[PDB]
């Protein structure tokens, strides 16, 4: 009856709710209209949800995803229309609203996302009131795996952390200098590439230089994004993968810059299903 | 009868030298194999110079251009071979060697490029011995117009330099945030876009925040790139447009980083032309 989604830049999880229960859970690759034309978006969409759904018809469909700026929301909604059957109108918004509906539900509060990309907001109870548009992983997205990987590759190959870690990194993923620039500048979804090579940071987090890179990235995010809200009486609900597995470094950078924190979960799906019933 | 060129990712100049003089000069847009396949680069080459190029059949031909790393040198080298007719063997290199031959000729010294992109090297007298390969404007290129433009836009729309400069920037180039993000993530040659909006820094240099942003970008460049060379007895020949019109901030950052300075040219061609005959 209802279909729920949350499209990250690298992956997408889909949920099917009927009479308030979960009758199906789906995974797909990431969809961002700034990395995917509607053909790629849609032909992928053909290959995705439809095969694992006995019935392709619904009454309500709610799709939240990265790159879903208002200028691109109708584009993505028409992509989903040419593949689904819903009795009412399709809602299409950003992943921030999914995170907010998941964390706070019908109540207000601050919500931030740290995964493939980064983002920060204040939320009313039914809609996002304010938002720092993150500009992406080239002009912002500070503190997220794609940016972490961007920083790490840059620092390593500028000989800023020595040869040992540089060689362990380039050997662990069997990459030459050419692979990076080809993968980042000429190959689809370079943010996936960066966010995927970024867990090397977690692997060698005991090194001060790597721990400091992660900490200073978290610092810059909080400074340039979360500080723009009333962070002195609001418990920032953090959602995302980077924020979950780097919990300690995030709490480090938060106590440094005075940013407050509340509940920190990795995926909004279980909080989203609670909201819809 | 020889032709020498130097194509930055934004522009390209071609020269045909006979009788010790320059007998003809044509200009075309920039070609970079990481934002243009070599055919597309090439499909313009038909449109620009050849229609006017009286003879495409001459002796030696030597082409230097950005993004033209060893992994990419042969592809571009055959593209010029399958239309062009040159009597001797093909030279293919990066813009750094043109800058070095122009700046240093047959003598050594440190040579740096500051325009659309960044790069760093020490040069012997026939070829570059050491180099910090800049990885481009997404993983490095610190101190370059695209990176300067990247930083300024990022800071502005995250409200890090106020509303006055942010608004003056967005109305003066008649850009909205979505247009920005569309131009950087979906539009060809985003490095030109950033480097073209970057002169806003020089225009508003009286603001402390912008002067410090430009200076600190220059600082880290010297730090992460030039410091990797012998900067204590070598007078760094800086080459480029950014380096000429931001001369004072560069000398500031040079006294800041103890780094020495030499010659500042924006374009190398007559020094390149001086080298050949
Ligand atoms: C241009 C781009 O990719 N933005 C995305 C965001 O998308 C919304 C629509 C936005 O741009 O504001 C997304 O919420 C965050 C977290 O996933 O990462 C950013 O990179
Ligand atoms: C990935 C990329 O585009 N790098 C280019 C450089 O190209 C060389 C070959 C290199 O990549 O090492 C170029 O020298 C400088 C200055 O123009 O700008 C960078 O952006």
Author numbering:
A (entry chain B), B (entry chain A): 1 to 277
The authors write:
Unlike other bacteria, the pathogenic Tannerella forsythia, a member of the red complex group of bacteria associated with the late stages of periodontitis, lacks biosynthetic pathways for MurNAc production and therefore obtains MurNAc from the environment. Sugar kinases play a crucial role in the MurNAc recycling process, activating the sugar molecules by phosphorylation. MurK and K1058 are two sugar kinases of the cell wall recycling system of T. forsythia, sharing a sequence identity of 44% and separated by a single PGN-scavenging operon within the genome. Structural and sequence data showed that MurK and K1058 both belong to the group of ribonuclease H-like kinases and are members of the ASKHA (acetate and sugar kinase/hsc70/actin) superfamily.
The production of MurNAc-bound crystals of MurK and K1058 was very challenging but eventually yielded crystals of MurK and K1058 in complex MurNAc (termed MurK/MurNAc and K1058/MurNAc, respectively). Both crystal forms diffract to approximately 3 Å resolution and contain six protomers in the ASU corresponding to three biological dimers. Crystals of MurK/MurNAc suffered from perfect merohedral twinning. The induced fit of MurK is triggered by binding of MurNAc into the cleft-shaped active site and results in a combined sheered rotation move of the N-terminal domain as a rigid body closing the active site over the phosphate acceptor sugar. The transition from open to closed conformation is based on helix α3, which slides over the C-terminal β-sheet towards the active site, resulting in a rotation by approximately 12° (calculated by DynDom) and a maximum translation of 6.9 Å measured for the Cα distance of residue S88 when comparing open and closed states. The anomeric carbon of the glucosamine ring of MurNAc adopts a β-configuration and is held in place by a strictly conserved catalytic residue D95 that establishes hydrogen bonding to the hydroxy groups of C4 and C6. G67 forms a hydrogen bond to the ether bond of the lactyl ether entity via its backbone amide, whereas D95, N119, and D141 utilize their side chains to recognize the hydroxy groups at atom C4 and C6, C4, and C1, respectively. The N-acetyl group dips into a rather hydrophobic cavity that is formed by the backbone of G67 and a set of three phenylalanine side chains (F34, F35, F137). No direct protein interactions are observed to account for the negative charge of the carboxyl group besides shape complementarity of the protein, predominately created by P134 on top of which the lactyl ether sits. Most obviously, residues S133, P134, and L135 in MurK allow for MurNAc binding by providing sufficient space for the lactyl ether substituent.
